[PDB]
Amino acid sequence: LPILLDYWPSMFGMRARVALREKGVEFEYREEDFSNKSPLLLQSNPIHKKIPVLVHNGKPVCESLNVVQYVDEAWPEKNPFFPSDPYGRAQARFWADFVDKKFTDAQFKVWGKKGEEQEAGKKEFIEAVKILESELGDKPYFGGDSFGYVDISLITFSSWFQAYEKFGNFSIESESPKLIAWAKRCMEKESVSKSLPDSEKIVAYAAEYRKNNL
């Protein structure tokens, strides 16, 4: 059974968790201690030493999105994540990059920072969620006619939504109800109803992060 080296509060590890659960793969979950990383984490990824890492057939796959694409290409029989068209997978890649970079930079600034960077990040976050709001035109999901690739990529920030709400002092739902509510449809799915830890714990965790570093 495929082995995930992961981190419970991580949204990215969640992306991999989502992908295997949506498919129908049976797998073993592993919690890494970055303070005392397990031998398989060091042996699989000797340079960056980061999660997630899925070992399937004795061959390691690192980074979250690279795993998600690895999950889709390895199992292409039931629920395909991408469209059949070159240009449609194109836009999903374009957008997974957007969620993964600037969206993830603005939110990291929402939960991991103070003062001007926080306010700046808040302005960014609402724009980015507004932009995401905008790409949807207004679309139930992202990646195909069902659950999809950039859905997977972003639905994991939904367990931190509560944390951004709290630390950023903003309603992502009053300003973009559709996106939070895009998350709450997807929350009916077991790949999101089992994979994402309680937002309460993430909220507690990220706050706790604020305590350890200054």
Partner 1 sequence: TFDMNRVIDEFDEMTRNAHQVQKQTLKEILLKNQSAIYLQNCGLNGNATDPEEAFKSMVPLVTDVELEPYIKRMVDGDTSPILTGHPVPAISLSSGTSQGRPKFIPFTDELMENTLQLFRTAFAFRNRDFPIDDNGKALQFIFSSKQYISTGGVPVGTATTNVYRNPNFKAGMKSITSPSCSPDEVIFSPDVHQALYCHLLSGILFRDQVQYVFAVFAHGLVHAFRTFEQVWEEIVTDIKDGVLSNRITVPSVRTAMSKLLTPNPELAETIRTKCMSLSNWYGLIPALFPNAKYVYGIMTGSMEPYVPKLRHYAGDLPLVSHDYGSSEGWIAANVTPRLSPEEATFAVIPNLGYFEFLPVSETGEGEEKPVGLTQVKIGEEYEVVITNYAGLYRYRLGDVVKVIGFYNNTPQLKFICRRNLILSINIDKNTERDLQLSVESAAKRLSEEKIEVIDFSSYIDVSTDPGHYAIFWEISGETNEDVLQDCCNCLDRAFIDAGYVSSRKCKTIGALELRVVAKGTFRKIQEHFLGLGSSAGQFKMPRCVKPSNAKVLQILCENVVSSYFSTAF
Residue numbers at the binding site for partner 1 (CB under 8 A): 159, 161-162, 165-166, 171, 173-174, 177-178, 180-185, 187-188, 193, 196, 198-200
- Nearest CA to 206 out of 123, 122, 128, 107 is that of 107
Q: Is 152 annotated as a binding residue?
A: no
Rounded to a whole number, what is the largest CA-CA distance in the chain? 49
- Does 16 interact with a copy of itself (rule: CB under 8 A)? no
Q: What is the DSSP string of 51-80?
A: S-EEEETTEEEESHHHHHHHHHHH--SSS-
Choose the stretch contacting a copy of itself; rule: CB under 8 A; options: 18-26, 64-72, 110-118, 187-195.
Answer: 64-72
Element (H, E) at 149: helix 149-154
- Does 170 interact with ligand GSH (rule: CB under 6 A)? no
Q: Can you say whether residue 49 is alpha, beta or left, with left for phi > 0 and alpha for psi between -120 and 50 degrees?
A: left
- Nearest CA to 113 out of 10, 210, 9, 212 is that of 210
212 makes contact, choosing from a copy of itself, ligand GSH, partner 1, none, with CB < 5 to 8 Å by partner type, with none
Choose the stretch contacting a copy of itself; rule: CB under 8 A; options: 26-34, 62-70, 139-147, 155-163.
Answer: 62-70
- Does 10 interact with ligand GSH (rule: CB under 6 A)? yes
82 or 111: CB nearest partner 1: 111
Cβ 153 to ligand GSH shortest distance, Å: 9
Q: Is 10 annotated as a binding residue?
A: yes
Across the beta sheet with 28-31, the strand order is 28-31, 3-6, 53-56, 59-62
50 token code pair = 């980061």
- Does 69 interact with a copy of itself (rule: CB under 8 A)? yes
159 makes contact, choosing from a copy of itself, ligand GSH, partner 1, none, with CB < 5 to 8 Å by partner type, with partner 1
Q: Is 51 annotated as a binding residue?
A: yes
Element (H, E) at 3: strand 3-6
Q: Is the dihedral of CA 124, 193, 188, 20 positive or negative?
A: positive
Binding mask 92-131 for a copy of itself (x = CB under 8 A): -xx--x---------------------------------x
Which of positions 43-102 make contact with ligand GSH (CB under 6 A)? Answer: 50-52, 63-64
Q: Is the dihedral of CA 110, 116, 119, 124 positive or negative?
A: negative
Binding-site residue positions for glutathione: 10, 51, 64
